Amino acid sequence: MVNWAAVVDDFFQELFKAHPEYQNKFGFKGVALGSLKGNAAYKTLAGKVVDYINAWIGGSADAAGLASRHKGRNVGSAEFHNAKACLAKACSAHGAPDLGHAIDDILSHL
Numbered sequence: 001m002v003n004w005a006a007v008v009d010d011f012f013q014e015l016f017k018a019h020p021e022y023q024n025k026f027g028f029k030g031v032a033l034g035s036l037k038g039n040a041a042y043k044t045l046a047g048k049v050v051d052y053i054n055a056w057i058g059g060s061a062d063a064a065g066l067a068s069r070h071k072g073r074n075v076g077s078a079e080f081h082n083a084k085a086c087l088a089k090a091c092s093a094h095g096a097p098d099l100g101h102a103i104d105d106i107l108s109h110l
């Protein structure tokens, strides 16, 4: 039983460390990284990312839909390549399987 919630938390720490400006697009803009887990906007968003990972594992993920919604937020290939690397670190740090192919699937629609 992978703790995907823990992996996603480390994913966002990696993501926003390397690219702080990405955080500006979220409802938790401006919040200190060490404080994120206590922020209500963050908790909801991280929960949806955990949901997406479990949908991919479970076979129900909609990569086309997720890509389209991110393009709608002006988030594209460059950002998702960066996210891929950040998620790879977060999985490794928790002994979790690599999610590279899930990200590749989103990338194919970007």
Ligand code: HEM
Binding pocket: 022, 023, 025, 026, 027, 045, 048, 049, 052, 066, 069, 070, 073, 075, 079, 080, 083, 084, 087, 103
């Ligand atoms: C591993 C890569 C990523 C995954 C799996 C992912 C997944 C998700 C999910 C499931 C949502 C919830 C709403 C929806 O389903 O569309 C979401 C929202 C969002 N994501 Fe991502 N995302 C990723 C990378 C990124 C990156 C790099 C950015 C760069 C800024 C980003 C920006 C956003 C924004 C702005 C929202 C909406 C926030 C809001 O409505 O308040 N995402 N993402």
